[PDB]
Amino acid sequence: LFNTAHGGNIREPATVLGISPDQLLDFSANINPLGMPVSVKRALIDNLDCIERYPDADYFHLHQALARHHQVPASWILAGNGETESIFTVASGLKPRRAMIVTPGFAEYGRALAQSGCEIRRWSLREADGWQLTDAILEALTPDLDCLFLCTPNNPTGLLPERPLLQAIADRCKSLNINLILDEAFIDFIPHETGFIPALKDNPHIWVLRSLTKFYAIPGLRLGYLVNSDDAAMARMRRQQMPWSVNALAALAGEVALQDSAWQQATWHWLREEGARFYQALCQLPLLTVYPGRANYLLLRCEREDIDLQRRLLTQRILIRSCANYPGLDSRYYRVAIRSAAQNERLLAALRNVL
Template sequence: MTPPTQIFLPTHGGQLRQIASRYGFEPEQLIDFSANINPAGPPASVLIALQQALGDAAILVAYPDLELTELKKALGEASGILAENIAVANGFVPLLEAALRSLKIARCFLPVPSFSEYRQTLTNAGVEVAQYYLPQGEGFSYQPEKLLRAALDNGCDALLLANPQNPSGALCGAGGMRDLVEMAAKHRIKVLLDEAFIDYVPTESLTRSAVELENLIVFRSVTKFFAIPGLRVAYAVSSASSIQNLNDRLAPWPVSSLASEAASTALQDSAYVEETRRENYLRRTWLEREFASVKIFTYPSSTNFLLLRFAADVDVQLLWEKMIAEEQIVLRSCANFEGLAPVHLRTAVRSEAENERLVHGLERVLLRMKR
């Protein structure tokens, strides 16, 4: 088929309806490697719980629990913390907005490349942004002492970080990250830490540390790992006083009863959790080897996605488009990741068959582009 003359680049992953409409496909004809969602789909236990909930009219007739008691209990048990240290909302952005207001952040240090919603949320909240370019040669990894020194030089009162980092997947070990938080505390600097993908390396999380470190707020996602992003559940963890101040700035009924039921059930499905981690590791390492064999560079990742770097002579945006038009595969365009050279694409880790199709598809398209 003939691609549109102007390349369409979505600002987020997972925009299959837009892309399918743009390129003349049905959404189910496309394989989505642009969104970092568990390819296993939701746990069977979640689907059963939702079906049972929908069989009870009271679930829909009654307002959700304002305190989200059962959900916070499940989150607390999964994380080893108390409900009083947890705030819940329908996604990361409302939690970050509430945190910025409650902490009265004036100037935030933002290492890039990073998720585009970070800067947008900071700007919308009237917070000044001090941008810092992470070195590509270091795999965009965090160097705690360098980060703190740069934050101090820029007069920042907060740092907004992601661990593992997005879009690179780079991990800063829990020890190094805790050192950074403790050093920042000495200078009265708050640390806002997005751990959306820490479920793949849970031993490196600072979720429990956030309870005792007064200058730290950790943000977690439930929906990516458990493949239920349509239900929108995220939570923040900090000291009891910080969480109270954050909760005071959240709208009432931040998540629906059905979303609460699904997330609570998912968090208790330990078999699903362990299988996801095992399968993701095997599939990611297989992809890394296969990409290396066809001369596509991948950055070290601890997540369910890989950042790909292509040769300088490859038109990456045209490659992104041709993968859709010719192979029905949607990768994540990295055009809107600040501080990232235009030779990158990001891919999720999916099933074995889909991953194999991705590697062969890229190989075919790259070969055709050279002719």
């Protein structure tokens, strides 16, 4: 149906139907469905004129805000024009000769590594393990590796590797001098998970990637960041990333969003309640295998390869992600965002009529 690299392709999908992109209910991009944080809307509106000046090239205020939030030194943080920029920055700044990625996973790790000239090795997740990362990867880590990229939780599976396994991997990487890059883009949605930022002080080989776009519903503004405790390496990252890459409005949102308790609480309540109901409902459908995603999306496997769920749902103005373009997966796999109860009901109503 589509040849697009990533979800959120409402313009392309609308063209297939011959309708307006705003008429589609998009389940292919995983953005918090609750609207926009009040802290963000107000800030942008009341300070719009700040676009008349270049942002501070050093982003002192923005980095201090992110640093105070995590209670780490500001020099450990470099904001990017989306976490997507942070991925390209860490790949180019580390300039690995040999790197390992885990498949299926977000396509941009491989693209960034290829652009930097790296030999890429793939650790293949297995359907027999429910697509969860296992300790079998430890033996695959060798001294000649420069970096290992893990996504926690993984895109598209939604699975969070076990904490003791991540700790074992971090320790093995420390011993073998391998940089461990942890993509925590979706970790904000799992309240009881702290991630690895609290453990960076004694682990300069670990790099954490964060995004504010999924959780705070600001993907159009573009804001993410990189965190690491190696003084020299972070200084090099600041030189590698293009000047003024974070726009002024994105910086203003990143300065207030992390303190928006109302939005955070509403988001966790919504996901805990509606997330479980949606997962349960999907699990009942024949021919479907649903993986237990931990954030705001779920990976689905349709038993009947001859049935194109993306095409069938598009007829009902519902856009889902086909995971055929992920190495390791095939056309039987799809990913759907978790949205509002009413929105989820529309998707369920459509799937039930197909299956």
